[PDB]
Enzyme design. Structure first.
Site, short mmCIF file in Angstrom:
data_model
loop_
_atom_site.label_atom_id
_atom_site.label_comp_id
_atom_site.label_asym_id
_atom_site.label_seq_id
_atom_site.Cartn_x
_atom_site.Cartn_y
_atom_site.Cartn_z
N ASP A 35 2.09 67.32 20.80
CA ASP A 35 1.14 68.43 20.82
C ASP A 35 -0.18 68.03 20.17
O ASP A 35 -0.29 68.04 18.93
CB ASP A 35 1.77 69.62 20.08
CG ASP A 35 0.86 70.84 20.05
OD1 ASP A 35 -0.13 70.86 20.81
OD2 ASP A 35 1.16 71.79 19.27
N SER A 199 -17.18 70.03 27.89
CA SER A 199 -17.27 69.71 29.30
C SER A 199 -18.65 70.07 29.81
O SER A 199 -19.30 71.00 29.32
CB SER A 199 -16.19 70.49 30.07
OG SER A 199 -16.36 70.39 31.47
#
Length: 330
Positions: A35, A199
């Site tokens: 994770d 992004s």
């Protein structure tokens, strides 16, 4: 040193991925959920409340000659999906794909929430976010990666998750045969303890690319792709009959649909998520309403590039003095 381990979907939907981890002496192999959105290595154990264990493999520290109780240490964690666990702490030897750390904090669960009990395939979590998020008290502990880092050939790990197929976690090297083209690297902020990056935009299907900054985290422990409501609405508007359902808890779509792809930007590069990756199947057994793999982050408070996004790429988690993230097509 290096390590290399195969990671395997837990079910036919890629709801999560498990990776075998050797703990203790002799080794006890548990299948852990790696994770990159948390920083605790915790396991089902011989100390876990019996009624809360249902099929998981447990770590039994009394059977490990290298286990030592970390005196006075406790831990307690709550995850974004509302699940939680807590317990005490041992140090022990932990190996992943041939890479060994001695003195790793292994957090033994005394209690786990129902969602963990109900998932027989996940024996615990191995956190790969920054150690500043580790919950051990009163002395915070380091992640497996943080402990291994100085010994690694290069201070990196990579995630290569498969679509409906196994994939690989590598430690200490970049497998140049595992991706196409080049790896594009992008800046990371560690301010919130996550692999947080920005992004450069998105496209829906064959549509034009929208240049827009989207801050979010690369999180292997989250199944879906969670993005701003504007972006998510633009995606689902291209699927006839798709709608946001408050009763179901997100966007659903007719199972008869063909889903468009979704592209996200990494600098000037582009990662394409095929439409099929966005199908999470019937909302309930036998239903013709299917659950979407792109959902709104509104009210999460953060955008999350989970498995839906990451499995479309070869992803480098670069733990150099100034960390960065790399993405390549594959």
């Amino acid at each position: 040193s290096t390590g290399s381990a195969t990671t395997t979907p837990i079910d036919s939907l890629d709801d999560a991925y498990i990776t075998p981890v050797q703990i203790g002496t002799p080794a006890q192999t548990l299948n852990l959920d790696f994770d990159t959105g948390s920083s605790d290595l915790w396991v089902f154990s011989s100390e876990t409340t019996a009624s809360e264990v249902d099929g998981q493999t447990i770590y039994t520290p009394s059977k490990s000659t290298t286990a030592k109780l970390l005196s006075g240490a406790t831990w307690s964690i709550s995850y974004g999906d509302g699940s939680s666990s807590s317990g005490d702490v041992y140090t022990d030897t932990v190996s992943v794909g041939g890479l060994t750390v001695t003195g790793q904090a292994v957090e033994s669960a005394k209690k786990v929430s129902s969602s963990f009990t109900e998932d027989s395939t996940i024996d615990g979590l191995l956190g790969l976010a920054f150690s500043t998020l580790n919950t051990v008290s009163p002395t915070q502990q380091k992640t497996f990666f943080d402990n291994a880092k100085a010994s690694l050939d290069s201070p990196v790990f990579t995630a290569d998750l498969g679509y409906h197929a196994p994939g690989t976690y590598n430690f200490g090297f970049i497998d140049t045969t595992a991706y196409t083209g080049s790896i594009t690297y992008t800046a990371v902020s560690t301010k919130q303890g996550f692999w947080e990056w920005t992004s450069t935009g998105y496209a829906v299907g064959s549509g034009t690319f929208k240049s827009t900054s989207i801050d979010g985290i690369a999180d292997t422990g989250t199944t879906l792709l969670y993005l701003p409501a504007t972006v998510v609405s633009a995606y689902w508007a291209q699927v006839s009959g798709a709608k946001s359902s408050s009763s179901v808890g997100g966007y659903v779509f007719p199972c008869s649909a063909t889903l468009p792809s979704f592209t996200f930007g990494v600098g000037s590069a582009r990662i394409v998520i095929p439409g099929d990756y966005i199908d999470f199947g019937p909302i309930s057994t036998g239903s013709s309403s299917c659950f979407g793999g792109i959902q709104s982050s509104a009210g999460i408070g953060i955008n999350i590039f989970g498995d839906v996004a990451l499995k479309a790429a070869f992803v480098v988690f670069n733990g150099a003095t100034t960390p960065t993230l790399g993405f390549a097509s594959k």
